[PDB]
Design an enzyme around this catalytic site. Structure first.
Site, PDB file in Angstrom:
ATOM      1  N   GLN A  11       0.819  -1.208   0.000  1.00 55.00           N
ATOM      2  CA  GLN A  11       0.000   0.000   0.000  1.00 55.00           C
ATOM      3  C   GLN A  11       0.855   1.261   0.000  1.00 55.00           C
ATOM      4  O   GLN A  11       0.537   2.234  -0.699  1.00 55.00           O
ATOM      5  CB  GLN A  11      -0.926  -0.004   1.206  1.00 55.00           C
ATOM      6  CG  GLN A  11      -1.573   1.318   1.421  1.00 55.00           C
ATOM      7  CD  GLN A  11      -2.406   1.362   2.647  1.00 55.00           C
ATOM      8  OE1 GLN A  11      -2.406   2.337   3.397  1.00 55.00           O
ATOM      9  NE2 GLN A  11      -3.170   0.314   2.841  1.00 55.00           N
ATOM     10  N   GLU A  51      -4.685  -6.261  -1.489  1.00 54.49           N
ATOM     11  CA  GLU A  51      -6.007  -5.860  -1.051  1.00 54.49           C
ATOM     12  C   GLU A  51      -6.599  -4.911  -2.079  1.00 54.49           C
ATOM     13  O   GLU A  51      -5.863  -4.257  -2.827  1.00 54.49           O
ATOM     14  CB  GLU A  51      -5.970  -5.168   0.322  1.00 54.49           C
ATOM     15  CG  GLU A  51      -5.518  -3.713   0.272  1.00 54.49           C
ATOM     16  CD  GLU A  51      -5.208  -3.127   1.628  1.00 54.49           C
ATOM     17  OE1 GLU A  51      -6.148  -2.665   2.306  1.00 54.49           O
ATOM     18  OE2 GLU A  51      -4.021  -3.088   1.995  1.00 54.49           O
ATOM     19  N   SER A  75       7.176  -0.986   1.216  1.00 50.71           N
ATOM     20  CA  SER A  75       7.406  -0.769   2.632  1.00 50.71           C
ATOM     21  C   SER A  75       8.008  -2.017   3.262  1.00 50.71           C
ATOM     22  O   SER A  75       7.799  -3.142   2.803  1.00 50.71           O
ATOM     23  CB  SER A  75       6.101  -0.405   3.341  1.00 50.71           C
ATOM     24  OG  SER A  75       5.198  -1.494   3.323  1.00 50.71           O
ATOM     25  N   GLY A  86       2.102  -6.974   5.249  1.00 50.02           N
ATOM     26  CA  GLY A  86       2.336  -8.224   4.547  1.00 50.02           C
ATOM     27  C   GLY A  86       2.434  -8.065   3.047  1.00 50.02           C
ATOM     28  O   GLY A  86       3.302  -8.659   2.409  1.00 50.02           O
ATOM     29  N   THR A  87       1.574  -7.233   2.466  1.00 45.82           N
ATOM     30  CA  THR A  87       1.592  -7.070   1.019  1.00 45.82           C
ATOM     31  C   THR A  87       2.772  -6.240   0.544  1.00 45.82           C
ATOM     32  O   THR A  87       3.037  -6.204  -0.659  1.00 45.82           O
ATOM     33  CB  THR A  87       0.288  -6.436   0.543  1.00 45.82           C
ATOM     34  OG1 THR A  87       0.251  -6.433  -0.890  1.00 45.82           O
ATOM     35  CG2 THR A  87       0.171  -5.023   1.073  1.00 45.82           C
ATOM     36  N   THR A 120       3.975   2.315  13.711  1.00 50.28           N
ATOM     37  CA  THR A 120       2.526   2.197  13.556  1.00 50.28           C
ATOM     38  C   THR A 120       1.985   0.770  13.613  1.00 50.28           C
ATOM     39  O   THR A 120       0.761   0.597  13.646  1.00 50.28           O
ATOM     40  CB  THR A 120       2.069   2.830  12.231  1.00 50.28           C
ATOM     41  OG1 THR A 120       2.718   2.171  11.138  1.00 50.28           O
ATOM     42  CG2 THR A 120       2.364   4.328  12.182  1.00 50.28           C
ATOM     43  N   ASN A 123       9.564   7.763   7.924  1.00 54.56           N
ATOM     44  CA  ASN A 123       8.407   8.636   8.072  1.00 54.56           C
ATOM     45  C   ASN A 123       8.605   9.703   9.138  1.00 54.56           C
ATOM     46  O   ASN A 123       8.118  10.822   8.970  1.00 54.56           O
ATOM     47  CB  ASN A 123       7.172   7.800   8.388  1.00 54.56           C
ATOM     48  CG  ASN A 123       6.668   7.050   7.182  1.00 54.56           C
ATOM     49  OD1 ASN A 123       6.365   5.865   7.262  1.00 54.56           O
ATOM     50  ND2 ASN A 123       6.587   7.735   6.049  1.00 54.56           N
ATOM     51  N   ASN A 151       4.541  11.269   0.702  1.00 55.38           N
ATOM     52  CA  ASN A 151       4.824  10.548  -0.531  1.00 55.38           C
ATOM     53  C   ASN A 151       5.208  11.492  -1.659  1.00 55.38           C
ATOM     54  O   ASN A 151       5.950  11.091  -2.557  1.00 55.38           O
ATOM     55  CB  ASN A 151       3.625   9.705  -0.966  1.00 55.38           C
ATOM     56  CG  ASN A 151       3.129   8.745   0.107  1.00 55.38           C
ATOM     57  OD1 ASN A 151       3.873   8.258   0.980  1.00 55.38           O
ATOM     58  ND2 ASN A 151       1.833   8.475   0.044  1.00 55.38           N
ATOM     59  N   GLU A 160      25.432   3.476 -13.486  1.00 51.84           N
ATOM     60  CA  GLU A 160      26.412   4.309 -12.799  1.00 51.84           C
ATOM     61  C   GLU A 160      26.080   4.450 -11.322  1.00 51.84           C
ATOM     62  O   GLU A 160      26.992   4.589 -10.501  1.00 51.84           O
ATOM     63  CB  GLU A 160      26.517   5.689 -13.450  1.00 51.84           C
ATOM     64  CG  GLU A 160      27.077   5.659 -14.854  1.00 51.84           C
ATOM     65  CD  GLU A 160      27.259   7.037 -15.456  1.00 51.84           C
ATOM     66  OE1 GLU A 160      26.876   8.027 -14.806  1.00 51.84           O
ATOM     67  OE2 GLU A 160      27.784   7.126 -16.586  1.00 51.84           O
TER      68      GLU A 160
HETATM   69  N1  LIG Z   1       4.066   7.418   1.955  1.00 51.58           N
HETATM   70  C1  LIG Z   1       3.261   6.512   2.532  1.00 51.58           C
HETATM   71  N2  LIG Z   1       3.685   5.554   3.451  1.00 51.58           N
HETATM   72  C2  LIG Z   1       2.789   4.668   3.988  1.00 51.58           C
HETATM   73  C3  LIG Z   1       1.455   4.736   3.605  1.00 51.58           C
HETATM   74  N3  LIG Z   1       0.746   3.791   4.238  1.00 51.58           N
HETATM   75  C4  LIG Z   1       1.589   3.108   5.019  1.00 51.58           C
HETATM   76  N4  LIG Z   1       2.848   3.623   4.894  1.00 51.58           N
HETATM   77  C5  LIG Z   1       3.989   3.065   5.639  1.00 51.58           C
HETATM   78  O1  LIG Z   1       3.769   1.673   5.768  1.00 51.58           O
HETATM   79  C6  LIG Z   1       3.678   1.254   7.115  1.00 51.58           C
HETATM   80  C7  LIG Z   1       2.503   0.298   7.250  1.00 51.58           C
HETATM   81  O2  LIG Z   1       1.847   0.229   6.007  1.00 51.58           O
HETATM   82  P1  LIG Z   1       2.051  -1.070   5.088  1.00 51.58           P
HETATM   83  O3  LIG Z   1       3.304  -1.804   5.494  1.00 51.58           O
HETATM   84  O4  LIG Z   1       2.116  -0.653   3.637  1.00 51.58           O
HETATM   85  O5  LIG Z   1       0.731  -1.957   5.332  1.00 51.58           O
HETATM   86  P2  LIG Z   1       0.351  -3.060   4.222  1.00 51.58           P
HETATM   87  O6  LIG Z   1       1.628  -3.488   3.541  1.00 51.58           O
HETATM   88  O7  LIG Z   1      -0.601  -2.451   3.231  1.00 51.58           O
HETATM   89  O8  LIG Z   1      -0.347  -4.296   5.004  1.00 51.58           O
HETATM   90  P3  LIG Z   1      -1.853  -4.850   4.747  1.00 51.58           P
HETATM   91  O9  LIG Z   1      -2.898  -4.163   5.645  1.00 51.58           O
HETATM   92  O10 LIG Z   1      -1.800  -6.340   5.041  1.00 51.58           O
HETATM   93  O11 LIG Z   1      -2.184  -4.715   3.287  1.00 51.58           O
HETATM   94  C8  LIG Z   1       3.458   2.507   7.933  1.00 51.58           C
HETATM   95  O12 LIG Z   1       4.185   2.457   9.139  1.00 51.58           O
HETATM   96  C9  LIG Z   1       3.981   3.620   7.052  1.00 51.58           C
HETATM   97  O13 LIG Z   1       5.297   3.916   7.445  1.00 51.58           O
HETATM   98  C10 LIG Z   1       1.034   5.679   2.703  1.00 51.58           C
HETATM   99  O14 LIG Z   1      -0.147   5.724   2.382  1.00 51.58           O
HETATM  100  N5  LIG Z   1       1.938   6.556   2.178  1.00 51.58           N
END
Ligand SMILES: Nc1nc2c(ncn2[C@@H]2O[C@H](COP(=O)(O)OP(=O)(O)OP(=O)(O)O)[C@@H](O)[C@H]2O)c(=O)[nH]1
Ligand SMILES: Nc1nc2c(ncn2[C@@H]2O[C@H](COP(=O)(O)OP(=O)(O)O)[C@@H](O)[C@H]2O)c(=O)[nH]1
Ligand SMILES: Nc1nc2c(ncn2[C@@H]2O[C@H](COP(=O)(O)OP(=O)(O)O)[C@@H](O)[C@H]2O)c(=O)[nH]1
Lengths: 440, 87, 158, 428, 428
Positions: free
Chosen positions: A11, A71, A140, A144-145, A179, A206, A228, A254
């Site tokens: 995500q 998702e 990230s 999980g995803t 988080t 972050n 972002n 490079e």
């Molecule tokens: N720039 C940016 N960073 C994000 C965002 N959402 C989540 N993050 C980072 O990702 C961490 C957790 O989000 P994810 O690891 O992406 O959660 P996920 O991989 O979608 O896990 P699922 O709910 O199983 O799909 C947070 O602590 C943030 O640091 C976003 O919308 N924008």
């Protein structure tokens, strides 16, 4: 000729993808619908779009990224929103059950129902590509995803395209604030598998984005969109020399050839120059020397690691805009005499200076119309502090059997945690014999 | 769901995969999401919140079927005879 | 007016029986229905029941609504907790009560009474509209006694 | 399409359900006559989460209403937003499980669970990714528990891999109604721990304090005691229904809020909660939300969360907010209240964020926490057990309906083995 | 940014604080409903020194209302500016104080200051850089002396670095609205000496004197009296709500007006005080502003300044006025009156001006005097205490509550031990 493929997994990857793709659309003339406007034009004529944007007959331009997320609804907002016509309908790969912030649910159970389609589309995008320059994976080190699916994608891309460069745009979880609770598990279990399948891992934190937005951007209350977009400016400025022309053009080969000394040590730090916020931007002289000082200042660093607690290895400076080269020669001469920035004894020259003749574009919103930028990409030893601060959390959670059943009962095995910690011990080890001074 | 810009404007197709609901659509079967999503949303708006008698005479020689009255119609030809289906 | 004995003694076992007609011919698979309103003046409540014939279809569906009040301005949205409650309270002691005199907030609740439900009108009981077609002899006596109108020609349902 | 299936067994549960069903119908603009009459897109997009469509926007609620006595059946039926629950989804009975777990389980109840697992399947088949089950079952009293637990065990058997968040109303000594709460309820725990995975226990007692010392309602009717719980529910599955960042799903919560497989007894929580006489004076900003979602008043259970440190808490904020403050307020919550969070789970507070606030507000924060003080919650019901079990009283009406003193011993055995792991982790 | 927390205790303090909030609301342009309908954008510039912001511009004071009976609370709300106070900091109580210091401090007051401390903890935590507190109370009488001292002791214990105004109404000799004023004042001053950084004495006889001899009123009511006290109540804290040169905040006044640590009791005064018949005959400027200021007619405490030397004095001017016009006359006051100012402190005048004056007036100012004539008041309270105490009269309530004969004599010794320094500094 020089085309780059971006794979946005997780995500955070998808939202940073929305930011970087809206930045690309408003940096070129590529409209949200997809036709470059009739009664307008921009700059770089009829070849500069043949980067990340793709050409189709009669003018309907398409991106060549692969948005993958296990998702829906976060793919659904990206597709339903203001970029509904640009994206090709199948490049948006949706899962059906959420990957549940679990390495096992990203890597060993829901890993087969979509990776055939993802690799199939990677093959079709590689078909319409004269020179496959590289892969940039936006993800990230958290859920999980973003962990398991990225980690599963890495060995299949290493198997099929072993000769191509692949690099990571990473969301590391913050050493202070955080988080989610199994961030240490997920981060270690994905970086174990991506250590041998990553040539360079640009890292973004972050909390560092937060206090840069507080201090320089004068936003006391920022959001993920503001984070972002600042990541997106980094991405676009790193991938700029294939797009346009300048004095020193930096290739993505490079980048690896100048920034990773040893094959395991490939964890640098990005940072940006002027992150000033319009109502205080035109008051400043805005010089090449002072932005070169500001990127090495230990507050604009885009992960929360102190650079004074270690030695730099290789710094890659990418300037954009009206940059006279002798300004950066004087700036590097000014850098090499300050004692606050310590170098290793085995890299006498370490500055990869590249210049691109185009100023940063401005998304309608936060950032200021500045006719200069530089991204500073430094391999330092200070990432060992982040590894220590996360491995301490891993040991403290592992000592008493926390959250292990969700991993082991869904595809993982008990050992992979232990040898992932062994690899973290090996990496934290190697970061000390690379940083120690020569005595022989 | 109804973000098809409403009215009769082109926009009405939810991109393939749109896991979103199209109130009153799965209860239809036949063509491709694009033109479905279109008609699917239209469905909501609705309430939101022989054939030979005329020039097409002839019935086609040997037509498989019973033209009302044929049983007792002795005359010219299937054509002329069937120049008025519902006469 | 926050007492119950007044209504509870004036109209203790007095019931207004209204025969009605729900129109659902415009429903896709539906049909018109026979609703019997019982307005209880003792607690200002409306229950409505459904009377249904032999070998009907639909079940023995108890009553249609139950013994509560009725929101007259269509179907309203339910609010966040503690909005449409009793008299406003300022603070608690330190079980306790204060009776704030400056009532302001979600007190604007507009509800049917005997005045807004007369023979010949269409009432919007929770969405659907149902027309009042006939009444009983006790209702005729009450509406001659209080409001003085006679006009009791029924509008026969279907 | 992630659909969810909600069970409605037991007078209490059936009522909490109706008020719950109202709120979710009151967010997707579902009218008390079926047709949707709202005016927002994000409302319909995900109607698959709770309302299956039909011939003519009749979004009938995917519900399974069950009762051994047709009491709450009609009661709910003749209710407000209640002439929509499918007539077939209304399985009835002809008797009544007069407060007796035996009846609800190894007896009458059982000879209906088939006629209950029948419709549930029709539902499952009608779904696509049944994200899981949500049962409003009063652990106490009859029907509710007996029948519910039976279905809970049965459902799992059919679909093993699945989520099971049981919104249950554990009895809190203070106030009591049925005089068999110890016995009847005690049983549940046993068949819960080994079949549950997200117990959201609520307490009539606690909710009453939250309807007097936070909402200031002179006469707190059960109706309001329902909305408080009802909200918690339609607030937990927020992400699987509306857009936003950090979309945390009904699973994500369980894979970050359950340390050990059995340590899964959580307590609820709703944030924007003030009185009718202060709505205009309160400032609904992030700090405020936290300074109430982390006290001992907004928690809808009865176990001073400050008696025992929590192991893993989480929150689903729902409204245009800025992660920065969310992240800070929470990091700060830890550093501030650090004696009330285990030191064996670094980073112990999950923070989701939707992009749609609840109708009639601008921000919301459902609370869900694996507290350790829940130990007391069960300790009392066990502390009671003895009294009635010691003199084996109120047991003749329980053992003579297909039961044995054996079950009691084993049920209590688990209560001990549930109030046992807690005191261990109590000090990491 | 600096914020002041206003607490008001007792009937006297509650009415004076209500009139003070009316004065501040009319000064800052806020209607009784709470919205802003002003004329200048500068009037909203530093509103959050006294007002916490709510949603939609419904600004409400940072005020804790406290009393031991819910009649003063009902009266304060029944006043005109009643839709302005938060119901959460509206801390009432069902009891009867009986004008008893023992019942204010060692009885139900001690059971209600827990809630008072909780709500003032919330208001103090919801701040950026808190500077201090404002307790409005009566030195004599119940609640304001009984609960007031306990509240000051707890506030000082939880915040020991912040400036603490106590605007205290002191007893009068010629009339007495309470028999046990000497007991209550002697018990209260024993605390008010060693806690508060500065205390502002109001004598009710001097309010009558300033209403007849200067204001030329016929029947002066409590509304007029508490309004006149609210004038200087506002006028002290204006450099933090409006701009100007020589802005002096609360600690700046504390430093320049407390020479020795225990001598902080002051005498206030406001001096555009014009009678209606004689106002249009007045030449209102800085000269006669200072002349009306420094006389023994505008002193709000019945202590004649000609009976003692001035230790130090501050003047908070308000209005567009010229600087040597302030300076030549604030030197001329000391050069003319040399036997009324101390010699060991040369140049004992503080000057602080502000830009915007109060409405309708072109210029105002506030007198803050720290005279050696406060010994009159404290020694007179001392013999009026000893006359009642030598026979142990009106003492059985205090002794039977749980006090003893011991605790009164240290309060009387502290009376004498403030009487000695304020006399020996006047005698050098
Ligand atoms: N720039 C940016 N960073 C994000 C965002 N959402 C989540 N993050 C980072 O990702 C961490 C957790 O989000 P994810 O690891 O992406 O959660 P996920 O991989 O979608 O896990 P699922 O709910 O199983 O799909 C947070 O602590 C943030 O640091 C976003 O919308 N924008
Ligand atoms: N919050 C809430 N609690 C209820 C409601 N109805 C009943 N209860 C509680 O449920 C408890 C007993 O219910 P129970 O006998 O188990 O009902 P049964 O499951 O049908 O047997 C009582 O203590 C009530 O406080 C309701 O509508 N809302
Ligand atoms: N300035 C002013 N003083 C008041 C007012 N009401 C009462 N007082 C004074 O307060 C003194 C005693 O009040 P007190 O007994 O302490 O009231 P309590 O706090 O309710 O017990 C009397 O001598 C009055 O002069 C008022 O409205 N304004």
């Amino acid at each position: 000729q020089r085309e780059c493929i971006s794979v946005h997994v997780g995500q955070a990857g998808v939202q940073i993808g929305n930011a970087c793709w809206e930045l690309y659309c408003l940096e070129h003339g590529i409209q949200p619908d997809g036709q470059m406007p009739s009664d307008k034009t921009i700059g770089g004529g009829d070849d500069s779009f043949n980067t990340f944007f793709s050409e189709t007959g009669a003018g309907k331009h398409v991106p060549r990224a692969v948005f993958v997320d296990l998702e829906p609804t976060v793919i659904d907002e990206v597709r339903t929103g203001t970029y509904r016509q640009l994206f090709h309908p199948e490049q948006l790969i949706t899962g059906k059950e959420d990957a549940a912030n679990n390495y096992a649910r990203g890597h060993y159970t829901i890993g087969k129902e979509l990776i055939d389609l993802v690799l199939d589309r990677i093959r079709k995008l590689a078909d319409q590509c004269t020179g496959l320059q590289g892969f940039l994976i936006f993800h990230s080190f958290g859920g999980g995803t973003g962990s398991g699916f990225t980690s599963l994608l890495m060995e299949r891309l290493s198997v099929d395209y072993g000769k191509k460069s692949k690099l990571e745009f990473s969301i590391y979880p913050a050493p202070q604030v955080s988080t989610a609770v199994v961030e240490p598990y997920n981060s270690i279990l994905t970086t174990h598998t991506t250590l041998e399948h990553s040539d360079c891992a640009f890292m973004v934190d972050n909390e560092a984005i937060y206090d840069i937005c507080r201090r320089n951007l004068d936003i006391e209350r920022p959001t993920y969109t503001n984070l972002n977009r600042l990541i997106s400016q980094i991405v676009s400025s790193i991938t700029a020399s294939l797009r346009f022309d300048g004095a020193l053009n930096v290739d993505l080969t490079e980048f690896q050839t100048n920034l990773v000394p040893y094959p395991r040590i490939h964890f640098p730090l990005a940072t940006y120059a002027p992150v000033i916020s319009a109502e205080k931007a035109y008051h400043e002289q805005l010089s090449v020397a002072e932005i070169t000082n500001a990127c090495f200042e230990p507050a604009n660093q885009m992960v929360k690691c102190d650079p004074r607690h270690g030695k730099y290895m290789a710094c890659c400076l990418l300037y954009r805009g009206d940059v006279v080269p002798k300004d950066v020669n004087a700036a590097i001469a000014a850098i090499k005499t300050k004692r606050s920035i310590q170098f290793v004894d085995w890299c006498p020259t370490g500055f990869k200076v590249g210049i691109n003749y185009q100023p940063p574009t401005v998304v309608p919103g936060d950032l200021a119309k500045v006719q200069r930028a530089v991204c500073m990409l430094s391999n330092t030893t200070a990432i060992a502090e982040a590894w220590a601060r996360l491995d301490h959390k891993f040991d403290l959670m592992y000592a008493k059997r926390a959250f292990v059943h969700w991993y082991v009962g869904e595809g993982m095995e008990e050992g992979e945690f232990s040898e992932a910690r062994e690899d973290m011990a090996a990496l934290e080890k190697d970061y000390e014999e690379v940083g120690m001074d020569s005595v022989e | 769901s109804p973000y098809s810009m409403d009215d009769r404007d082109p926009r009405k197709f939810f991109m393939s995969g749109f896991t979103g609901y199209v109130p009153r659509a799965r209860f239809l079967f036949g063509s491709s999401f694009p033109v479905l999503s279109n008609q699917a949303l239209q469905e909501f708006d609705q309430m939101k919140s022989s054939r030979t008698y005329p020039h097409n005479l002839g019935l086609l020689p040997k037509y498989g079927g019973y033209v009302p009255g044929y049983k007792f119609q002795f005359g010219r030809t299937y054509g002329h005879l069937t120049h008025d289906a519902l006469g | 007016s926050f007492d119950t004995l007044k209504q509870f003694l004036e109209y203790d076992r007095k019931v207004l029986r209204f025969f009605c007609l729900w129109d659902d011919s415009g429903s896709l698979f539906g049909d018109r229905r026979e609703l019997i309103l019982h307005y209880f003046l003792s607690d200002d409540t409306i229950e409505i029941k459904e009377v249904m014939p032999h070998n009907s279809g639909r079940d023995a569906m108890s009553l249609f609504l139950q013994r509560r009040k009725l929101p007259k301005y269509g179907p309203p949205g339910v609010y966040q907790p503690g909005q449409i409650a009793d008299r406003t309270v300022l603070n608690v002691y330190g079980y306790s009560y204060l009776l704030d005199k400056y009532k302001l907030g979600n007190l604007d609740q507009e509800f049917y009474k005997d005045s807004d439900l007369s023979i010949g009108t269409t009432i919007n009981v929770w969405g659907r509209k149902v027309l009042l077609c006939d009444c009983d002899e006790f209702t005729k006596t009450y509406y001659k006694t209080k409001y003085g109108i006679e006009n009791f020609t029924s509008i026969s349902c279907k | 399409m992630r659909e969810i299936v909600h069970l409605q067994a037991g007078q209490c549960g059936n009522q909490i359900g109706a008020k719950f069903w109202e709120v979710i119908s009151d967010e997707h603009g579902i009218d008390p006559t079926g047709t949707y009459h709202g005016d927002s897109d994000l409302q319909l997009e995900r109607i698959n989460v709770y309302y299956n469509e039909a011939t003519g926007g009749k979004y009938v609620p995917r519900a399974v209403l069950v009762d051994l006595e047709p009491g709450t059946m009609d009661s709910v039926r003749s209710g407000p937003f209640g002439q929509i629950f499918r007539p077939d989804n209304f399985v009835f009975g002809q008797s009544g499980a007069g407060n007796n777990w035996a009846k609800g389980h190894y007896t009458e109840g059982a000879e209906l669970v088939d006629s209950v697992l029948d419709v549930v399947r029709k539902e499952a088949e009608s779904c696509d990714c049944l994200q899981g089950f949500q049962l409003t079952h009063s652990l106490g009293g009859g029907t509710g528990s007996g029948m519910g637990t039976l279905l809970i065990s049965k459902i799992r058997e059919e679909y093993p891999d699945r989520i099971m968040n049981t919104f249950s109303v554990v009895p809190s000594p203070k106030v009591s109604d049925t005089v068999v709460e110890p016995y009847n309820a005690t049983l549940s725990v046993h068949q819960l721990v080994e079949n549950t995975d997200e117990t959201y226990c609520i307490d009539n007692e606690a909710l009453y304090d939250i309807c007097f010392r936070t909402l200031k309602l002179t006469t707190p009717t059960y109706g309001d005691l329902n909305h408080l719980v009802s909200a918690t529910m339609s607030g937990v599955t927020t992400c699987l229904r509306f857009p936003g960042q950090l979309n945390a799903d009904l699973r994500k919560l369980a894979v970050n809020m359950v340390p050990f497989p059995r340590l899964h007894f959580f307590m609820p929580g709703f944030a924007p909660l003030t009185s009718r006489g202060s709505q205009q004076y309160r400032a609904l900003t992030v700090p405020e939300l936290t300074q109430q979602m982390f006290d001992a008043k907004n928690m809808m259970a009865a176990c001073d969360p400050r008696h025992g440190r929590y192991l893993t808490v989480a929150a689903v904020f729902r409204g245009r907010m800025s992660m920065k403050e969310v992240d800070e307020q929470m990091l700060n919550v830890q550093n501030k209240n650090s004696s009330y969070f285990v030191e064996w789970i670094p980073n112990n507070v999950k923070t989701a964020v939707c992009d749609i606030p609840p109708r009639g507000l601008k921000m919301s924060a459902t609370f869900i926490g694996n507290s350790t003080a829940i130990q007391e919650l069960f300790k009392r019901i066990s502390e009671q057990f003895t009294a009635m079990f010691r003199r084996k009283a109120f047991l003749h009406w329980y053992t003579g309906e297909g039961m044995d003193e054996m079950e009691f011993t084993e049920a209590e055995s688990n209560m001990n083995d549930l109030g046992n792991p807690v005191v261990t982790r109590g000090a990491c």
